[PDB]
């Protein structure tokens, strides 16, 4: 069910991204972190980002809007002792990431200050992680599911207003949480430029139940039909030249393209640490 696909490929790399390497790789759109090491001192310069723009690559900045990350410029040492009401527990699965009450003004103003830097660096899109934080707080019983969903929708809308006031063409791509559209009045679906998803056909190496995949696709197809691109990333490539492995990459690409999803086969380590070239396939 796969028609609106304005990019031939995409790159997801959050560590060790190299503008020169990317600029001459043949990837069309690259989602990287806004810093070489995530930290303030590693922030890409306007010039380093312009290398990619100059080669016709569309560079997009990852921004985690559902969790505080303890190595970022915004993190404060005082938060360990005098903990803000909106800073919650550490993510068992991602040490150094903390769930936040993303509806509190102070968290929003941190995220706006991060967007401020991303705009000035010359990024052409933002890729917004932990939309699914709405599910986390609902599971914790801290607020209602509807409350959380609304709050996250409104926040992404406020993020769209902030960045488009400065850069009207800025792309806006949330990651995961696409089921949040159940609570959208349609303004979020129209405001995004596209939507990115992890673990659609495969959870790492392991193929998913077809029903689970179809529920997710129900949301993505609707967006596609409205002129919104869908970036897929499955962590299917185990690094080997095995037969199993390459057949799996090819199965993933075929399932992706047949349903309108632009695929990126990433390493099953989850590190997103290199530009993952796969001879004859990625880029294609």
Numbering used by the authors: 28 to 311
Q: Which text from the study accompanies this structure?
A:
Endo-galactosaminidases are an underexplored family of enzymes involved in the degradation of galactosaminogalactan (GAG) and other galactosamine-containing cationic exopolysaccharides produced by fungi and bacteria. Whereas the fungal enzyme belongs to family GH114, the two bacterial enzymes do not lie in the current GH families but instead define a new family, GH191. The TIM-barrel core structure with fully conserved active-site residues and a negatively charged substrate crevice is conserved among all the families. The putative active-site residues (Asp156/Glu225 for TmGH191, Asp323/Glu391 for Env-GH191 and Asp157/Glu225 for FsGH114) overlap well with the experimentally verified nucleophile and general acid/base Asp189/Glu247 in Ega3, Asp196/Glu222 in Sph3 and Asp160/Glu223 in PelAH.
We could not detect any binding, or enzymatic cleavage of the GAG oligomers, for the T. maritima enzyme, which raises the question as to whether the T. maritima enzyme is an endo-galactosaminidase or whether GAG is not a substrate for this family. The TmGH191 crystals all showed a varying degree of twinning. The structure is composed of tightly packed trimers stacked on each other along their common pseudo-threefold axis. A pair of adjacent trimers form the asymmetric unit, with the two trimers having slightly different orientations (11.5° rotation around the common axis). The stacks of trimers pack into a sparse honeycomb-like structure with wide wells around the pseudo-63 axis and a solvent content of 82.5%. Sph3 has a rather less charged surface due to its activity on neutral GlcNAcylated GAG. A closer inspection shows that the substrate crevice is partially blocked in ‘apo’ TmGH191, especially over the active site via the loop between βi2 and βi3, with Trp121 bridging the active site and blocking access towards the putative −1 subsite. The TmGH191 crystals prepared in this study were soaked with GalN and GalNAc, and a data set was obtained for a GalN-soaked crystal. While no distinct density for a bound carbohydrate was observed, difference density in the substrate-binding crevice of TmGH191 suggests that something has bound, although it could not be conclusively modelled. Some flexibility in the side chain of Trp121 was noted when comparing the native and soaked structures.
